[PDB]
């Protein structure tokens, strides 16, 4: 029992010290992330937004493209229906930032 207790004590102390090591490394790491982010103008925010939009589009259109078949029917002066699907995807992609806005309270679009 004494040997097991010493084993547990030493292994736990070592892993806690390792956790502290990554903690210090990650803190000194994120300080420079903040420093670099401070020097971002509208061009950089636009680049970030346009780099993140395709990923959200993928995550919203991946499950949707699992449908076996889609039937489109038009009548009168109406549209065929492809605009309906694209509008549904785009509406979800544009309402998600507002839903996140409702909780976080920090803007996502500069204009």
């Amino acid at each position: 029992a004494e040997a097991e207790a010493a084993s547990v004590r030493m292994r736990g102390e070592a892993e806690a010290f390792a956790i502290g090591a990554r903690a210090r490394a990650e803190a000194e790491q994120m300080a420079k992330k903040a420093e670099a982010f401070q020097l971002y103008q509208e061009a950089a925010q636009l680049d970030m937004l346009l780099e993140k939009l395709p990923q959200v589009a993928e995550e919203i259109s991946g499950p949707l493209t699992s449908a076996n078949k889609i039937t489109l029917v038009s009548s009168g002066s109406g549209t065929m229906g492809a605009a309906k699907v694209t509008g549904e995807v785009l509406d979800i992609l544009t309402r998600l930032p507002e839903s996140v806005e409702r909780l976080t309270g920090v803007s996502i679009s500069q204009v």
């Binding site: 903690a23 970030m48 959200v56």
Partner: protein, 73 residues
């Protein structure tokens, strides 16, 4: 065994509290762009989670135009 567990738990507390404390000043220096980066990074995971039920859709029927229900196909 209980003493060993108490020692290791206190060590975890030491380390995790130091982690949170050091991360505090890191978050304190965040501007508008950095918060925007955080939100944009969080967005795809939330979108993937919300869209997961859409995976099991079987068939989609779309109709357009304000007309009667006699034409069919």
């Amino acid at each position: 065994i209980g003493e060993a567990e108490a020692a290791v738990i206190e060590a975890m507390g030491k380390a995790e509290a130091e982690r949170m404390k050091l991360k505090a000043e890191a978050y304190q220096k965040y501007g508008d762009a950095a918060k925007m980066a955080l939100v944009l990074e969080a967005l795809p995971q939330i979108a993937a989670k919300i869209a997961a039920p859409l995976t099991k859709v079987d068939e989609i029927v779309v109709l357009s135009g304000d007309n009667s229900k006699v034409t069919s196909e």
